[PDB]
Amino acid sequence: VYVPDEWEVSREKITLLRELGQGSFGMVYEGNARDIIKGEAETRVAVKTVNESASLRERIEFLNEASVMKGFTCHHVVRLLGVVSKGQPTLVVMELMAHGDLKSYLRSLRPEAENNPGRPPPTLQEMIQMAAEIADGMAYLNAKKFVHRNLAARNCMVAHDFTVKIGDFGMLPVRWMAPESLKDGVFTTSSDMWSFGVVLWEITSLAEQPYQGLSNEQVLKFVMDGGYLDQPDNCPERVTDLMRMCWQFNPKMRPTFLEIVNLLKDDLHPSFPEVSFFHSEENK
């Protein structure tokens, strides 16, 4: 049972512009929110909805996810801005990530891409920046005692200034799963580290399908036998080294998300210590 609180916004303050794509509970829209953030007259938003066919229990669960998001204040995790519980349909207002999911964004930077924005593919500097941003958001989730369980490029988001953030998470994708998860169903921050390595592989391959040519049955056998992804053509050695650390068979040998940020801290944008969880007073 959900009880309305301080975060609640009036229904008519949100104007929906267009559909973005299907979410877990229903359709996600691109919208504009009137006076949602202090100092901002209008804010570009992503509005999560519950579809008509869903149950009251499913509608309550959606609002309980919004209650959880209230305590999340990381710059590298997509933030909740407000909620609408009174009436029908149920709404959850998130910050808009202007360039959408990381997978779709990486595919658009390919030479053959019909929707190429006239920009080059990610530079080594940009790849390292993305890696640290994803790892910082994941370090924040881990400090919050949450295991993602579904980390992949399709789940990471790109902001207007190209900042990468963790989208929706765990409050089968066999090609991103750690050997212990494929075998025993064990999901931890260490299995999330394995998936992070696959995300790095997606960045360097411009969102190619992992283990292309191998079926879901062959991926399961290959990964559990100690097999891992081959490095993509012209992959920078620094990113390859990160992938290898992520792909250790024993989850105990894999680095932590904070250790990843610590390995990359010196080669980042000057704003990183001003916005990161790693450099915040919360990282203790």
Ligand X SMILES: COCCN1CCN(CCn2ccc(Nc3ncc4c(n3)-c3c(nn(C)c3-c3ccccc3)C[C@H]4C)n2)CC1
Helices and strands (DSSP H and E) totals, the chain: 9, 7
Q: Pick from 99, 107, 148, 175: which binds ligand X (CB under 6 A)?
A: 99
Count interface residues toward ligand X (CB under 6 A): 19
Site string for ligand X, 36-55 (x = CB under 6 A): ----------x-x-------
23 binds ligand X (CB under 6 A): yes
Q: Measured from the CB atom, is 2 or 162 closer to ligand X?
A: 162
Stretch that binds ligand X, among 8-16, 95-103, 180-188, 194-202 (CB under 6 A): 95-103
How far, in Å, CA of 226 to CA of 248, rounded? Answer: 9
Q: Measured from the CB atom, is 141 or 258 closer to ligand X?
A: 141
Which residues in the chain belong to E strands, given as ranges?
A: 14-22, 27-34, 42-49, 80-84, 91-95, 156-158, 164-166
6 forms bridges with which residues in the sheet?
none
> If DSSP codes are grouped into helix, strand and coil, which group holds residue 27?
strand
Q: Measured from the CB atom, is 165 or 254 closer to ligand X?
A: 165
Find the largest Cα–Cα distance for the chain: 56
How far, in Å, CA of 11 to CA of 88, rounded? Answer: 10
Q: Pick from 58, 61, 126, 168: which binds ligand X (CB under 6 A)?
A: 168
Q: How far is the CB of 57 from ligand X (least distance, A)?
A: 21
165 forms bridges with which residues in the sheet?
157
Q: Pick from 26, 31, 82, 100: which binds ligand X (CB under 6 A)?
A: 100
Site string for ligand X, 209-228 (x = CB under 6 A): --------------------
94 binds ligand X (CB under 6 A): yes
DSSP 209: P
Q: Is the N-terminal amide bond of 273 cis, ω within 30° of 0?
A: no
Q: Measured from the CB atom, is 75 or 99 closer to ligand X?
A: 99
Amino acid in position 18 = R
Site string for ligand X, 101-140 (x = CB under 6 A): x------x------x-x-----------------------
Count Cβ atoms within 10 A of the Cβ of residue 278 and give its class: 0-12 exposed, 13-18 middle, 19 or more buried: buried
Residues that bind ligand X (CB under 6 A): 20-21, 23, 28, 46, 48, 78, 94, 96-97, 99-101, 108, 115, 117, 157, 167-168
